[PDB]
Structure 1
Amino acid sequence: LNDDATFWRNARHHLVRYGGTFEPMIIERAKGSFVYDADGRAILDFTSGQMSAVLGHCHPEIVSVIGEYAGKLDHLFSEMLSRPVVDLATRLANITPPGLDRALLLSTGAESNEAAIRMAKLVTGKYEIVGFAQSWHGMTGAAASATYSAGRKGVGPAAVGSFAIPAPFTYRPRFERNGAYDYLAELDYAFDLIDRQSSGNLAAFIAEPILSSGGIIELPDGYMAALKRKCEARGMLLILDEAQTGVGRTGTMFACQRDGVTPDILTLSKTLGAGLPLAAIVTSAAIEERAHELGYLFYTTHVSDPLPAAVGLRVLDVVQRDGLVARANVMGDRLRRGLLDLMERFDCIGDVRGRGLLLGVEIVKDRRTKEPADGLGAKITRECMNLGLSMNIVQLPGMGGVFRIAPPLTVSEDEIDLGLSLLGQAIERAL
């Protein structure tokens, strides 16, 4: 049972709390689309762990590659190359858009964004970084300085030159022109303000193609292209953080492929490691050559470690051959349809958005007022867990609570249906 007195005693006495509250269960195993508590109760994992397990839990091919390299080639001095590293870097060059040629293999998402930001500052000779007002790029210094959805208070100044602009959000538009939401004009207006504040040192703009922590805000048609042009006109690099959108989750191998806009640097992490700590940045040959000429440094314990690289390569092999990018579209559309059906039934569902298997459901009190539903969102989430459905709701000011729904790309039709059913029941009893 989950009530193990000594487990909870040790947890309270010895864990640093780091945000939120801990779930009241003891997870003892995980397999595929489910995690199991100490009573053996299966819980449907509708967030793929921490928005990361694209192949689901304990996929046999990952188990196989992990054990193989753990016993054969594990960790190396960072100046020593090995085949998993060169193969993964080569695969990444080959599956990312033309213009992204060279990779750096790291461990975490914040870390990949730090490497990208450092590279942009170095090759531009500048230091100001612009991100979105509802962004999430990680907890470490430069990534946190460009993170606006949370965490900026109580911990002193952010990095010098940190700026944000509003993200285009079609469900809660606040910039009108000719009686309609003109998000491109909003983007111009924002950059004019950036330009006036800048010391003339804009190095890069960093962006998630779909803002996850910020409420599953998808950049609308033509926005990314317009953003890239704002960067080009200012000699800024565009860094796209695909920690959650990359590796097929949104229905294309990388979300940047949907808009056809190729960033100067692409960062990958959560979905690349599929649960394991592996991350990466990919950039063009021209930018990498210039960074090298200027002495680029990003040396870490695990940079180019063969075991993580071997895992990432197996993850890409599985996604490609089992056609998991396509599954994200088919299971994603099945899930979306089911969510829209719930929306037909429940007035509290104000919006269903997102792409592929990265969907968002926003809870409101009034669909006309779009008034956030205080407490209802939390209620629904608690009822889901009681029903055996693991969910996550994110709450930002001026917005209703948003469920972030991201099941493994290996999720079955019956599992999508089970989730939709448990969600409807949870709403029914939360009301």
Structure 2
Amino acid sequence: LNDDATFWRNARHHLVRYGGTFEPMIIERAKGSFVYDADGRAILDFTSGQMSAVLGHCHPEIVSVIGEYAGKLDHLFSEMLSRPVVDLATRLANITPPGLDRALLLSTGAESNEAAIRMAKLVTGKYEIVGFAQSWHGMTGAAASATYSAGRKGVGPAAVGSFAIPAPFTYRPRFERNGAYDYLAELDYAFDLIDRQSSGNLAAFIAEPILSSGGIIELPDGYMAALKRKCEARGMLLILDEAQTGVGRTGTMFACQRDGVTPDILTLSKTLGAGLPLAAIVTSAAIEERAHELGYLFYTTHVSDPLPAAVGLRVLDVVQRDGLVARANVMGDRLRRGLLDLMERFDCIGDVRGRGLLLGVEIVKDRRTKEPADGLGAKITRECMNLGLSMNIVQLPGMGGVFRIAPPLTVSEDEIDLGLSLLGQAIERAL
């Protein structure tokens, strides 16, 4: 039973609480699309852990590779190269769009964003960073100065020179031009304000192709291109954070591929490591040469370590080999349609958005008023869990609560169906 006295005692006495509230089960094992409690109850992992386990839990290939390396090549002094590092870097250059040639291998998303922000500052000689008011780039420093979704209050001033602009949100438009939501005009409007506050040191713009923490907000068509143009005109670099969208999740290897806009710096993390701490930045040769001439330095304990790199490589091999990006379109289509059917059934589902296997469901009081549902999301979440479906909901000011759905790319037809089933029941139970 999950109700182990010692376990719980130890947990209340020895853990720092870092947000949220601990689920009251004891996870004992994980496999594929499920996690299992101490009672052996199977729980469908509809979020791939923290949106990272693209290949599901404990995938045999990964297990196999972690094994070969753990006993052969583990961690090395930063100046020592090895084949997995070189092969992974080479691989990354080859599958990202042209113009993305050189990679830096790290451990976390925050590190990846910091490394990128630092290169941008060095190369341009400027220091102001612009991001979205609903962004999520991590908790460490700069990455945190660039994060507006949560964590700005009570901890003192943020980094000097940070600015945010509103993200385009088609579901709850707020900028009209001749009767329609004109998101490009909104962009123009936001940049003009920026231009007025800047001290003339605009270095880069950092963005997520799909705002994950911010409520599964997809940048609309032509937006990225318009953004990139805004940057070029100002001599700023464009940094794209694909921690959540990269590695096939949205139906393309990289989300940037869909739009066709290639960023100056691309950062990867959650999905690259598939559960293990591996992260990376990918940039053009020209940018790298410059940073190098300028003395760029970025040292971490685990940069270029062989084990994590061997794992990332294996992840890419599997994804390519098994046609997992394609699978993302197919299963994503199956899931989306199912969510749309739920929306047919229940008046509380206000919107179904996202792409591929990165979907969001916005819960509302009523479909016309679009009033956010107060307390219902929480109920729903509770029932899902009870029914055996692990979900995650996020609540942002001025929005209804949003369920972030993201099953493993390896998810089966049955699992998709099972999850759709448990969800409906949960909702029915929660009204």
Q: Which runs of 5+ in 2 are unaligned?
A: none
Pairs within 5 Å for 1:6-405: 6-405=6-405
CA–CA separation in structure 2 for the residues paired with 1:205 and 1:22: 35
Deviations 1:222-275 (A, max 9, x none): 000000000000000000000000000000000000000000000000000000
CA–CA separation in structure 1 for the residues paired with 2:200 and 2:161: 10
Deviations 1:121-172 (A, max 9, x none): 0000001000000000000010010000100011111010010000000000
C-alpha displacement of 1:22: 0.6
Deviations 1:360-390 (A, max 9, x none): 0000001111100010011001100000000
CA–CA separation in structure 1 for the residues paired with 2:255 and 2:19: 28
CA–CA separation in structure 2 for the residues paired with 1:378 and 1:399: 15
Deviations 1:99-132 (A, max 9, x none): 0000000000011000000000000000100000
C-alpha displacement of 1:44: 0.1
CA–CA separation in structure 2 for the residues paired with 1:216 and 1:270: 16
C-alpha displacement of 1:194: 0.3
**Partner SS, residue 366 of structure 1:** coil
Q: Identity rate of aligned residues, in percent? A: 100
CA–CA separation in structure 2 for the residues paired with 1:420 and 1:413: 11
Deviations 1:270-327 (A, max 9, x none): 0000000000000000000000000000011100000000000000000000010001
CA–CA separation in structure 1 for the residues paired with 2:20 and 2:327: 32
Deviations 1:317-359 (A, max 9, x none): 0000001000110000000000000000001000000000000
**Partner SS, residue 365 of structure 1:** coil
Deviations 1:35-83 (A, max 9, x none): 0000000000000000000000000000000010000000000000000
- Counterpart for residue 421 of structure 2: 421
CA–CA separation in structure 1 for the residues paired with 2:22 and 2:224: 37
C-alpha displacement of 1:429: 0.3
CA–CA separation in structure 1 for the residues paired with 2:327 and 2:383: 28
CA–CA separation in structure 1 for the residues paired with 2:366 and 2:391: 23
C-alpha displacement of 1:189: 0.2
CA–CA separation in structure 1 for the residues paired with 2:125 and 2:369: 47
State the Cα RMSD in Å.
Answer: 0.3
CA–CA separation in structure 2 for the residues paired with 1:99 and 1:370: 43
CA–CA separation in structure 1 for the residues paired with 2:19 and 2:110: 17
**Partner SS, residue 364 of structure 2:** strand
CA–CA separation in structure 2 for the residues paired with 1:316 and 1:381: 33
Deviations 1:404-423 (A, max 9, x none): 00000000000000000000
**Partner SS, residue 295 of structure 1:** coil
CA–CA separation in structure 2 for the residues paired with 1:321 and 1:53: 17
Please, what TM-score do these two structures have when normalized by structure 2? 1.00
CA–CA separation in structure 1 for the residues paired with 2:347 and 2:232: 44
CA–CA separation in structure 2 for the residues paired with 1:382 and 1:230: 44
CA–CA separation in structure 2 for the residues paired with 1:350 and 1:129: 34
Q: Which runs of 5+ in 1 are unaligned?
A: none
CA–CA separation in structure 2 for the residues paired with 1:292 and 1:17: 41
CA–CA separation in structure 1 for the residues paired with 2:16 and 2:284: 40
CA–CA separation in structure 2 for the residues paired with 1:277 and 1:18: 19
CA–CA separation in structure 2 for the residues paired with 1:350 and 1:297: 47
CA–CA separation in structure 2 for the residues paired with 1:294 and 1:140: 24
CA–CA separation in structure 1 for the residues paired with 2:16 and 2:113: 25
CA–CA separation in structure 2 for the residues paired with 1:76 and 1:287: 27
Matched pairs, number:
431
CA–CA separation in structure 2 for the residues paired with 1:387 and 1:342: 17
CA–CA separation in structure 1 for the residues paired with 2:177 and 2:190: 15
CA–CA separation in structure 2 for the residues paired with 1:205 and 1:110: 16
CA–CA separation in structure 1 for the residues paired with 2:110 and 2:151: 14
CA–CA separation in structure 1 for the residues paired with 2:313 and 2:161: 37
CA–CA separation in structure 2 for the residues paired with 1:328 and 1:417: 15
Deviations 1:181-215 (A, max 9, x none): 00000000000000000000000000000000000
CA–CA separation in structure 1 for the residues paired with 2:257 and 2:14: 45
